[PDB]
Design an enzyme around this catalytic site. Sequence first.
Site, PDB file in Angstrom:
ATOM      1  N   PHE A 110       0.678  -1.211  -0.218  1.00 32.72           N
ATOM      2  CA  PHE A 110       0.084   0.207  -0.097  1.00 32.72           C
ATOM      3  C   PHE A 110       0.932   1.633   0.175  1.00 32.72           C
ATOM      4  O   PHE A 110       0.411   2.191  -0.205  1.00 32.72           O
ATOM      5  CB  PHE A 110      -0.337   0.402   1.450  1.00 32.72           C
ATOM      6  CG  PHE A 110      -0.097  -0.193   2.425  1.00 32.72           C
ATOM      7  CD1 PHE A 110       0.191   1.303   3.250  1.00 32.72           C
ATOM      8  CD2 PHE A 110      -0.331  -1.498   3.476  1.00 32.72           C
ATOM      9  CE1 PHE A 110       1.166   0.953   4.744  1.00 32.72           C
ATOM     10  CE2 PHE A 110       0.840  -1.291   3.995  1.00 32.72           C
ATOM     11  CZ  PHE A 110       1.206  -0.571   5.112  1.00 32.72           C
ATOM     12  N   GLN A 170       3.419   3.035   3.259  1.00 29.84           N
ATOM     13  CA  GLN A 170       4.237   3.082   4.058  1.00 29.84           C
ATOM     14  C   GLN A 170       3.441   3.361   5.627  1.00 29.84           C
ATOM     15  O   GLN A 170       2.388   4.398   5.381  1.00 29.84           O
ATOM     16  CB  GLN A 170       5.207   4.005   4.311  1.00 29.84           C
ATOM     17  CG  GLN A 170       6.367   4.041   2.791  1.00 29.84           C
ATOM     18  CD  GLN A 170       7.322   4.855   3.154  1.00 29.84           C
ATOM     19  OE1 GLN A 170       8.796   4.586   2.893  1.00 29.84           O
ATOM     20  NE2 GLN A 170       6.567   6.528   2.259  1.00 29.84           N
ATOM     21  N   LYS A 174      -0.663   5.691   8.001  1.00 32.85           N
ATOM     22  CA  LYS A 174      -0.209   5.284   6.775  1.00 32.85           C
ATOM     23  C   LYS A 174       0.006   6.198   5.452  1.00 32.85           C
ATOM     24  O   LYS A 174      -1.222   7.113   5.522  1.00 32.85           O
ATOM     25  CB  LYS A 174      -1.711   4.010   6.697  1.00 32.85           C
ATOM     26  CG  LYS A 174      -1.380   3.292   5.482  1.00 32.85           C
ATOM     27  CD  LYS A 174      -1.835   1.633   6.200  1.00 32.85           C
ATOM     28  CE  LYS A 174      -2.384   1.378   5.060  1.00 32.85           C
ATOM     29  NZ  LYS A 174      -3.597   0.244   5.302  1.00 32.85           N
ATOM     30  N   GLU A 222      -4.501   5.417  15.781  1.00 33.48           N
ATOM     31  CA  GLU A 222      -3.186   5.191  17.250  1.00 33.48           C
ATOM     32  C   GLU A 222      -2.587   4.497  17.390  1.00 33.48           C
ATOM     33  O   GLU A 222      -2.448   3.304  15.930  1.00 33.48           O
ATOM     34  CB  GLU A 222      -4.406   4.236  18.458  1.00 33.48           C
ATOM     35  CG  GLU A 222      -4.899   3.310  17.665  1.00 33.48           C
ATOM     36  CD  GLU A 222      -5.682   2.609  18.741  1.00 33.48           C
ATOM     37  OE1 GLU A 222      -5.777   2.733  19.468  1.00 33.48           O
ATOM     38  OE2 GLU A 222      -6.715   1.441  18.041  1.00 33.48           O
ATOM     39  N   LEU A 264       0.402   2.197  17.432  1.00 33.60           N
ATOM     40  CA  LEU A 264       0.765  -0.259  18.672  1.00 33.60           C
ATOM     41  C   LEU A 264       2.218  -0.430  18.122  1.00 33.60           C
ATOM     42  O   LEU A 264       3.231   0.308  18.324  1.00 33.60           O
ATOM     43  CB  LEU A 264       0.000  -1.356  17.503  1.00 33.60           C
ATOM     44  CG  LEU A 264      -1.996  -0.912  17.395  1.00 33.60           C
ATOM     45  CD1 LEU A 264      -2.599  -0.943  16.458  1.00 33.60           C
ATOM     46  CD2 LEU A 264      -2.795  -0.779  18.596  1.00 33.60           C
ATOM     47  N   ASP A 270      -6.586 -10.345   4.551  1.00 32.73           N
ATOM     48  CA  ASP A 270      -5.350  -9.871   4.099  1.00 32.73           C
ATOM     49  C   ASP A 270      -4.612 -10.528   6.127  1.00 32.73           C
ATOM     50  O   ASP A 270      -3.995 -10.190   6.485  1.00 32.73           O
ATOM     51  CB  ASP A 270      -4.087  -8.965   4.155  1.00 32.73           C
ATOM     52  CG  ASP A 270      -2.914  -9.605   3.743  1.00 32.73           C
ATOM     53  OD1 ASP A 270      -2.764 -10.803   3.558  1.00 32.73           O
ATOM     54  OD2 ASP A 270      -2.379  -7.933   3.709  1.00 32.73           O
TER      55      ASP A 270
HETATM   56  N1  LIG Z   1      -1.903  -1.317   7.645  1.00 28.33           N
HETATM   57  C1  LIG Z   1      -1.204  -0.968   8.592  1.00 28.33           C
HETATM   58  C2  LIG Z   1      -0.949  -0.660   9.285  1.00 28.33           C
HETATM   59  C3  LIG Z   1       0.783  -1.073  10.351  1.00 28.33           C
HETATM   60  C4  LIG Z   1       1.102  -1.472   8.475  1.00 28.33           C
HETATM   61  C5  LIG Z   1       1.070  -3.609   8.694  1.00 28.33           C
HETATM   62  C6  LIG Z   1       2.370  -4.146   7.908  1.00 28.33           C
HETATM   63  C7  LIG Z   1       3.157  -2.827   7.763  1.00 28.33           C
HETATM   64  C8  LIG Z   1       2.758  -1.317   8.411  1.00 28.33           C
HETATM   65  N2  LIG Z   1       1.141  -0.886  11.127  1.00 28.33           N
HETATM   66  C9  LIG Z   1       0.593   0.010  11.655  1.00 28.33           C
HETATM   67  C10 LIG Z   1       0.242   0.631  13.085  1.00 28.33           C
HETATM   68  I1  LIG Z   1       2.314   0.719  13.933  1.00 28.33           I
HETATM   69  C11 LIG Z   1      -0.843   1.010  13.712  1.00 28.33           C
HETATM   70  C12 LIG Z   1      -2.259   0.972  12.651  1.00 28.33           C
HETATM   71  C13 LIG Z   1      -1.889   0.767  11.192  1.00 28.33           C
HETATM   72  C14 LIG Z   1      -1.112   0.176  10.981  1.00 28.33           C
END
Ligand SMILES: N#Cc1c(C2CCCC2)[nH]c2c(I)cccc12
Length: 347
Positions: free
Chosen positions: A36, A38, A54, A105, A107, A153
């Site tokens: 998608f 970054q 994102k 948020e 995580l 996914d």
């Molecule tokens: N979509 C997404 C999100 C990803 C990716 C998952 C694969 C590469 C990074 N990391 C996140 C975080 I820390 C917080 C919120 C959403 C996401």
Amino acid sequence: VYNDGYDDDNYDYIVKNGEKWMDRYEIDSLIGKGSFGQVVKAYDRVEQEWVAIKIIKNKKAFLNQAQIEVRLLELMNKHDTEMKYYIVHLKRHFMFRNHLCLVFEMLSYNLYDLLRNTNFRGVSLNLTRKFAQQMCTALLFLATPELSIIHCDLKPENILLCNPKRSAIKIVDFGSSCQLGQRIYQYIQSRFYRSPEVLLGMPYDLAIDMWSLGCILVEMHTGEPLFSGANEVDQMNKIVEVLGIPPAHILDQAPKARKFFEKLPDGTWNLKKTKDGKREYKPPGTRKLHNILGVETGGPGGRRAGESGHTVADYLKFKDLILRMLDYDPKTRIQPYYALQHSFFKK
Ligand SMILES: N#Cc1c(C2CCCC2)[nH]c2c(I)cccc12
């Protein structure tokens, strides 16, 4: 020459640590990458909180898919129920330098990071149960009729811990998701977690998420993917090693059945004939989950022998639930409400 110099050759924003955006967001660092685009860590000066941003690729196909993700997240996060807190919360979205940016948020580590930190020994059966119960509750939330959302996914990298020392989890990345009846792709799901109906080019529903979850839970306890196919043909053969040939009522309606199988004159199906004296796979159904899980031999690889919370009875319950999650037939594959009633979850 790409987006006036703000993008790379892969349509991604060139992330620069410390950059401030719109007098509100201070970008700390890139934390994750995907197809998608970054995800970066940043501080929101206005709300005085760390957030994950994102950054969608500056490319139409990716922007338009992320718009679907925005609609489904806002639909989920608006829903008046406590089940909505196994889904990551989208705080707001904005366009910056021709990139759609989704603010979540912040995580902690994903379930793959957790596996790697145990050096792929796998987490305990008790922790696997906690993840399984939260995920089944999450899938029950997605299955509510007004939502009817198929994540599409599910993988360890898309299930994240809220806090690094606690077991609470949230699902992220609804960028491949769709609602039931609004499906727009045939090549979906990460391959290791890809359902037979998707491999077979068949119509799919929310049950493909339950398949992925069953794959995920075995991997969380053994440390390694259950079906580690290198391509779709290898992927289907690995499933057949554990579960046997799929039933004829499925293969008779599968558009891509001949990519993997052959129909005999009696009407039964077999694997496609391999060339020369090439043996590569275990015969159908002889790679038993009973032995992969080490039900009677001390858990996976014997590595849980003598530990509490890893009894034979515990493993038998775990195996039965997994096999109910890995049912070939999407109409009889265990559904979230009934999965939560399974004896594996009883105190
Ligand atoms: N979509 C997404 C999100 C990803 C990716 C998952 C694969 C590469 C990074 N990391 C996140 C975080 I820390 C917080 C919120 C959403 C996401």
